[PDB]
Amino acid sequence: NLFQFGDMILQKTGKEAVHSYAIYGCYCGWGGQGRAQDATDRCCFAQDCCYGRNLVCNPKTATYTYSFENGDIVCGDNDLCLRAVCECDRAAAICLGENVNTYDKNYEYYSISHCTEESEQC
Amino acid sequence: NLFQFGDMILQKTGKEAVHSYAIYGCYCGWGGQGRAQDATDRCCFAQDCCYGRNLVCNPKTATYTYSFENGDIVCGDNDLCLRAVCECDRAAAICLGENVNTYDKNYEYYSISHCTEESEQC
Structure with missing residues (x-):
């Protein structure tokens, strides 16, 4: 779920997702539309795509089992959905941490008056 | 997609979701865990469950068709995925509007240090 994805993001980026x-x-x-603004935004798009690879999961409510193990994120579930959602979140958090170098505060609140040109495609 | 949900919220409440x-x-x-804090929070949990009902569907990317005409949100799609996500969003936006009277700014950023209780069940 988002709380967990937030904790993964904190671990990889040092940021609180809700403030960033x-x-x-x-x-x-x-x-979920418009042009992906930069590498950070393309990570979030990639997560969208990743969630889309399996069918009859609910990433909003999926409370998966994971831990941090020597700075890795390890997804503990044996099933399909919880594990798949966790692996997508681990991937997205990794990606975000790789791209904190181009994090640009001017993209905060950008969707208010942008994101109207044609959407990215998985 | 969330950009559209945000527009439905703007339509119904005049708030910008990103600031609220x-x-x-x-x-x-x-x-996506912990207890739902108030009526506003319950609308959002209800939307999560509503999304979860929708198999073979990625709500993050689903760009549906809808119009906002004379009070009413009308979802135009026949596409199963788009229609249903559109109906979940429309229900949630109307629900948030109905409960704006108890919107409590103290729940902004509440997920950082709370939301660890046993979760709501769809």
Whole structure:
């Protein structure tokens, strides 16, 4: 779920999602359309795509089992959904941490008056 | 997609989700666990469950068709995935509007230090 994805993001980036990623760009925040603004936004799009690879999961409610193990994120579930959701979140958090170098605060709240040009495609 | 949900919320409440619901409680913002804090938070948890009902569907990318005409949100799609996500969003937006009277700014950023209780069950 988002609480967990938030904790993974904290671990990889040092940021609290609700003060940063939660409102960022066209894909990290309340978006899902428009042009992905930069590498950070493209991570959030990639997560969207990743969630889309399996069918009859609910990433909003999926409370998976994971831990931090020597700075890795390890997804503990044997099933399909909880594990798949966890692996997508681990991937997205990793990706975000790789791209904190281009994190640009001017993409905060960008969806208010942008994100209207054609959407990214998985 | 969330950009559209945000527009439905703007239509119904005049709030910008990114400055409000996006970070509110345990279910509108970055939670998906813990208890639902108030009527606003319950609307968002209800939306999560509503999304979960919808198989073979990625709500993050689902760009549906809808119009906002004379009070009413009308979902135009026949596409099963788009229609249903559109109906979940429309229900949630109307629910948030109905409960704006108890919106409590103290639930903004609540997920950081709370939301660890046993979760709501669909």
